[PDB]
Design a protein around this ligand. Structure first.
Ligand SMILES: CCCCCCCCCCCCCCCCCC(=O)OC[C@H](COP(=O)(O)OCCN)OC(=O)CCCCCCCCCCCCCCCCC
Ligand SMILES: CCCCCCCCCCCCCCCCCC(=O)OC[C@H](COP(=O)(O)OCCN)OC(=O)CCCCCCCCCCCCCCCCC
Ligand SMILES: CCCCCCCCCCCCCCCCCC(=O)OC[C@H](COP(=O)(O)OCCN)OC(=O)CCCCCCCCCCCCCCCCC
Ligand SMILES: CCCCCCCCCCCCCCCCCC(=O)OC[C@H](COP(=O)(O)OCCN)OC(=O)CCCCCCCCCCCCCCCCC
Ligand SMILES: CCCCCCCCCCCCCCCCCC(=O)OC[C@H](COP(=O)(O)OCCN)OC(=O)CCCCCCCCCCCCCCCCC
Ligand SMILES: CCCCCCCCCCCCCCCCCC(=O)OC[C@H](COP(=O)(O)OCCN)OC(=O)CCCCCCCCCCCCCCCCC
Ligand SMILES: CCCCCCCCCCCCCCCCCC(=O)OC[C@H](COP(=O)(O)OCCN)OC(=O)CCCCCCCCCCCCCCCCC
Ligand SMILES: CCCCCCCCCCCCCCCCCC(=O)OC[C@H](COP(=O)(O)OCCN)OC(=O)CCCCCCCCCCCCCCCCC
Lengths: 73, 73, 73, 73, 73, 73, 73, 73
């Protein structure tokens, strides 16, 4: 559970990019092909970046859902 | 204002925020309650901003789906 | 009521600066001395920038207050 | 981590967000409910981020109050 | 007075770049050779950008000097 | 943590601010009141941040001077 | 709205992206599929954005070449 | 593989600058004279930054080429 330190590590714009990429996978099934990265340590780093977006997507949906300005349809 | 001009007007930060909000709606059903905005001119402006993110989400999805670095499930 | 167009005009960081300046005035009484600006059109432009921060402060407090993650003490 | 190091770690964007949240608390009473965070490690990280904004709000207030371009009421 | 509108058009980072270029000219004499640009459209745009930085340098100096956190040495 | 990483640690925004502050000092004499900082660790960190700007100002001056688009006046 | 304002209209992030895309085209031949855009107004706007990057690439090339810190190899 | 960590350390704008510098070298031959830096600390930092841009140029080319939105001409 380092996800918050990684928000500051990646920065706002790259954190938002990863969160968008996760949102794309969730509704369309379009997913980065992590198994086509040759080097293992790079695959681990890429997966860390993408997995942060997945976590951030879940945290962001929960936060917006906590506001009376949003509703679940 | 066309969608591309809106991207440049909002800037990358706020464009990504709106795109992420759209992704949350598509997967979560959690939707901004546009109707609860009382002023009709503010309602219109907020709708333009959110609708930009819906467009950008779909354009981004199509672009990633256009690349062999993404798989499709 | 152009305040939203001005968010995009000023940009994220300068919009946040103005909102912070308004928050400072609200709790400390420390306020920019607008009447010491010689030229009238500049005073009008500076007041527009500061007044946007005052509006944005009010909109932001209302939004956070709409979330169950915040409470009024 | 000292407050200045936190500024550089968070970056200007997120530092201003936290400073604005602190300003909202001081004037509105609207306060982030830190206690509702269940994980103790996440609670600590969020508290560090919000407490940075409280510090930055007071440092900013003092700096503006140090200038003849600001009046005091 | 187009300088304040130029700040918002340029944004913070490009505004600071121009102000640093002005500072470099003031202390070293190293100056951009605008007279070598013969496309007058390009020349006028470059002149407006550089002249903004010269104005911003003078306003920034005055503001910092207005603060007890700075001293004229 | 060395000096040579500080551009990326401070980030572009705050590195430009420090460089701007240095340029202001060089031709106006307006200088940050380091003597008013009474925690020696904070003073050291502030001195590092300001001196990075002084160094960056000197390097940027030399780089612009190395270009035939600039002339010493 | 002229060409010479587009740096500030697109902003630094997206101007750098366009410039990067142009550099990729110049040495790899990999080129954006303008022919796949079938709204003529959108095609024109995309062509303007891409050609700004081509122009900026040529200007930046010439500027770096004007410096004694760069050599033609 | 330090290049991905370098992206996050440098941030998007400085990462794109380095990638454009690499693109300029590839198409024009205009190359930074790293051999003129004799402070080996500074030299190594500059080399790491420029070498990142060279790697990023190759990865960015490959990614764009992987898309049906680009064609090799
Ligand atoms: C706009 C993008 C968000 C920008 C924030 C990011 C940085 C902030 C920059 C400084 C502060 C920004 C101030 C701008 C706030 C916009 C206010 C607004 O446009 O909405 C006003 C609307 C009025 O409602 P009305 O019925 O007329 O009430 C009258 C009495 N006020 O009342 C409301 O609508 C209240 C709720 C605001 C809804 C506007 C857009 C909301 C959709 C995006 C929410 C995303 C939250 C961020 C989380 C990111 C997670 C990915
Ligand atoms: C892992 C490797 C990663 C390396 C990548 C980085 C390499 C550096 C260069 C990458 C640049 C990406 C390619 C940019 C080419 C510009 C293409 C373009 O302008 O878009 C054309 C497209 C028109 O498509 P059309 O369907 O006809 O229009 C629909 C209705 N308007 O219009 C569109 O579809 C616009 C879609 C924009 C949605 C984005 C909103 C969020 C902002 C993201 C910021 C970064 C994205 C850059 C967008 C370029 C702007 C044009
Ligand atoms: C951190 C700064 C905000 C960054 C957003 C700006 C750009 C977003 C970048 C991409 C998306 C960012 C994703 C990061 C979200 C952080 C999530 C987090 O740290 O909080 C997790 C916390 C866990 O709670 P727990 O009891 O453990 O629940 C277990 C099941 N999840 O659950 C929660 O705490 C839920 C509420 C989140 C509280 C974290 C900080 C909130 C205080 C700032 C709110 C400001 C909202 C922005 C409005 C600006 C107006 C000025
Ligand atoms: C209208 C005209 C406007 C023109 C202005 C623009 C001109 C360009 C240059 C302006 C730069 C402003 C002055 C920068 C000088 C650096 C001084 C510094 O580093 O701060 C010293 C201060 C130490 O004070 P002390 O009380 O001893 O510490 C308390 C416990 N730590 O530590 C502090 O107090 C730090 C306070 C930081 C709080 C800011 C958080 C939000 C981020 C804002 C981004 C811009 C602010 C730049 C901050 C400089 C970073 C050091
Ligand atoms: C210039 C880029 C330097 C950095 C390159 C690094 C690679 C990545 C950078 C890409 C980012 C996009 C940059 C936009 C380029 C602007 C083009 C320009 O203004 O060129 C004007 C001038 C034209 O000279 P010309 O008359 O055509 O040549 C005579 C030959 N017969 O030719 C010139 O050289 C005049 C330039 C004046 C600017 C001086 C400021 C020095 C540092 C500026 C950095 C930011 C640029 C902001 C310029 C805004 C100008 C409106
Ligand atoms: C924090 C102070 C709030 C006052 C409002 C000022 C507008 C926000 C400025 C924040 C600038 C941060 C970026 C720094 C880049 C350089 C910009 C700059 O130097 O602007 C300062 C200048 C002052 O403007 P002004 O006083 O109205 O001029 C007429 C005076 N008789 O313009
Ligand atoms: C350099 C700034 C140019 C723009 C100036 C515009 C004014 C505002 C800019 C201020 C922003 C802060 C910039 C940080 C400055 C970095 C200093 C540096 O790296 O200089 C290294 C090199 C030293 O050369 P040296 O051996 O000391 O001279 C021999 C004399 N006996 O001397 C050098 O010149 C090497 C520089 C290599 C970078 C080439 C890239 C060209 C465009 C870079 C723009 C962004 C800079 C990123 C550099 C990161 C390097 C780690
Ligand atoms: C949108 C794709 C999501 C995939 C994750 C990629 C990380 C986010 C990258 C967004 C970059 C935007 C800024 C562009 C500046 C240049 C950065 C760049 O060129 O990075 C691309 C590169 C690909 O990395 P990678 O594929 O892991 O390398 C090993 C391959 N065997 O690294």
């Amino acid at each position: 559970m380092p996800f918050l330190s990684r928000l500051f590590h990646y920065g706002v714009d790259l954190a938002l990019v990863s969160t968008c990429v996760a949102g794309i996978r969730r509704s369309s099934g379009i997913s980065f092909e992590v198994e086509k990265i040759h080097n293992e340590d790079v695959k681990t780093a890429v997966e860390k970046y993408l997995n942060f977006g997945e976590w951030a997507f879940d945290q962001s949906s929960a936060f917006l859902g906590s506001s009376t300005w949003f509703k679940k349809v």
